[PDB]
Write a protein that binds this ligand. Sequence first.
Ligand SMILES: [Cl-]
Length: 86
Amino acid sequence: SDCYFGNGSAYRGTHSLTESGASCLPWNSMILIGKVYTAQNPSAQALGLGKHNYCRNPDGDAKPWCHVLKNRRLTWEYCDVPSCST
Ligand SMILES: [Cl-]
């Protein structure tokens, strides 16, 4: 939607931008091999983790995040989705 409710675990929108203004890596990236929260996750479907780079909260984190490259380094970061409450 236009916003996430609670911690956004049910969020299934198209926001693909982090707090720092960086665009998310897609969940199916080759770069995420070894990670748990990828498209190859056994529950990828249930989590909204697929061949996209949309902001998700598959792990009970605070709000929707995504994996990103922070100057060639692989990290993750919260995304820019406004809370439905803000
Ligand atoms: Cl992970």
